[PDB]
Design a protein around this motif. Structure first.
Motif, short mmCIF file in Angstrom:
data_model
loop_
_atom_site.label_atom_id
_atom_site.label_comp_id
_atom_site.label_asym_id
_atom_site.label_seq_id
_atom_site.Cartn_x
_atom_site.Cartn_y
_atom_site.Cartn_z
N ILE A 42 0.82 -1.45 -0.22
CA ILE A 42 -0.19 0.21 0.19
C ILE A 42 1.05 1.51 -0.26
CG2 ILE A 42 -1.64 1.11 1.08
CD1 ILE A 42 -2.32 -1.46 2.37
N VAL A 43 0.36 2.36 -0.70
CA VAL A 43 1.17 3.18 -1.10
C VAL A 43 0.50 4.97 -1.22
CG1 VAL A 43 3.29 5.07 -2.50
CG2 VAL A 43 3.20 1.69 -2.72
N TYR A 44 0.20 5.46 0.01
CA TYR A 44 0.06 6.76 -1.00
C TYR A 44 1.02 8.43 -0.43
CZ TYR A 44 -4.57 5.38 2.30
OH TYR A 44 -5.38 4.85 2.92
N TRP A 45 0.60 8.92 -1.37
CA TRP A 45 1.46 10.04 -1.65
C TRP A 45 0.64 11.27 -0.95
CZ3 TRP A 45 6.45 11.46 -2.66
CH2 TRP A 45 7.33 10.54 -2.83
N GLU A 46 0.73 11.98 -0.16
CA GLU A 46 0.53 13.21 -0.62
C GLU A 46 1.13 14.53 0.07
OE1 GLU A 46 -1.93 12.77 3.21
OE2 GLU A 46 -1.08 13.46 4.67
N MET A 47 0.60 15.95 -0.65
CA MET A 47 0.95 16.78 0.34
C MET A 47 0.09 18.02 0.94
SD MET A 47 0.90 19.83 -1.64
CE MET A 47 2.28 20.83 -1.80
N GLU A 48 0.33 18.53 2.24
CA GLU A 48 -0.49 19.02 3.18
C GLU A 48 -1.12 18.70 3.21
OE1 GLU A 48 0.84 22.17 1.29
OE2 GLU A 48 2.67 22.53 2.05
#
Ligand code: 8J8
Ligand code: 8J8
Lengths: 124, 125, 127, 124
Positions: free
Chosen positions: B37-43
């Motif tokens: 499982i991979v999440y990429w977020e910004m702010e």
């Protein structure tokens, strides 16, 4: 799929009191601690690091030493409960519970701290 | 234990160009996509969610439609690579890669965007 | 009415260059320097306190002492110009020029700093 | 060497109460009205614009419709107090008291608003 839920999004706490902020996660049958990871933080500062059934206080931020604990007994009911004592003004802000349990998710919680003037003056 | 590493935690990026920001995770033998499982977020704006072998555009923030891509090939190398096309000033800030793969961790990456006056004045509103 | 005015309210500058930010105020007759007050400040750090011709060096932030000055030549032309030499990434943000000259007004100015990766890496780890 | 001064740097006020934020300045001998500009703002928002003995409410920000007023008989005592009625959570933040009176200065005031849970829940 796998979802962390926060029934209470917002906590309003008095300076010096206690707060318990909570995150739910699905536990179908008995709880398997070996596959459970519970991480709690606020503003990049580490509060809780729960792997293979135990806390690790190696990177627990200074300002949460002996004030914060994961209620291990809530975990079997699918509740990651972060109990914080002696709340300060510096505790106000966004928290995050990140949970990995055959699947992975996180949620945020917003804490607001009310305080009288003397405490507010020292924190200014 | 399970440690996510970032070779660069600061990227400096010219406006309008393209960037790929990277997070490395341990791959024992052959990647098991079922367990990744991979999440990429910004702010707190979600960019990528990758579960069970597919990209979930479920709570994706609109300013990342058609611009953000995870290089699937690189996952089997143990490299969660986020490619963002046509970088804008609003893309500047803190990024998080969150990785679950028998174990869990996350890293922060800071992106700085350089831009000339014309782009900067338009972003000014 | 006394109107402080700003020709550019947005400056984009490269790390390491010099910048001059302009604020204009009406000067109709000859400049009366005794009645002029100029404050330049950046997010509540004070950079210039110019009162009656005297630059106050009581409250100039360590960050700008050694690098900032008011251009005294332009005062009687109605221009209060802040010059900052060798711009750093710390200089980015909103500036205010506050002017009291028979009346009072102020204007904001936003400053963006571009910098190569090398300068950005130094500031990122050590500022 | 004219200096604006604030009796207190910090206000802690309850949601829905009324607040007066105080601010003082050189007036030994009295009392030329015409040399006086008082400007009150909050984080870029104009609240109070006093010139030649009257407030001009054309620049007054929308969140201060009917709620911000300068109390004009105490200026003679060197006191420029801003009155805010029905304090809202939006009102927390840094305030600026700018005064020009044969000389010019300004001082910052920080306001923190305590509120019950039900008030905080809207916004959130
Ligand atoms: C930021 O330091 C962290 C963060 C951790 O978050 C784990 C976590 C828990 C639950 C879920 C998730 C997650 C959520 C969504 C998507 C993917 C993953 C995470 C991300 C867990 C961590 O130690 C177990 C540490 C600290 N140690 C860093 C490297 N060393 C080790 C031993 O590891
Ligand atoms: C930002 O609109 C303001 C701001 C004001 O600050 C007043 C003030 C009061 C007392 C002192 C000072 C001051 C403080 C320290 C040093 C120098 C000056 C100021 C600066 C006063 C104002 O009207 C009296 C106005 C409105 N000016 C109208 C012109 N409009 C435009 C768009 O062009």
């Amino acid at each position: 799929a796998f979802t962390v839920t926060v029934p209470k999004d917002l906590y309003v706490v008095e300076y010096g009191s206690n707060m318990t902020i909570e995150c739910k996660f699905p536990v179908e049958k008995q709880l398997d601690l070996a596959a459970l990871i519970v991480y709690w933080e606020m503003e990049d500062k580490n509060i809780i690091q729960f792997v293979h059934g135990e806390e690790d206080l190696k990177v627990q931020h200074s300002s949460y030493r002996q004030r914060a604990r994961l209620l291990k007994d809530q975990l079997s009911l699918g509740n990651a409960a972060l109990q914080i004592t002696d709340v300060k003004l510096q505790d106000a802000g966004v928290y995050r519970c990140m949970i990995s349990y055959g699947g992975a998710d996180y949620k945020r919680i917003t804490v607001k701290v009310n305080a009288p003037y003397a405490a507010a003056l020292e924190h200014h």
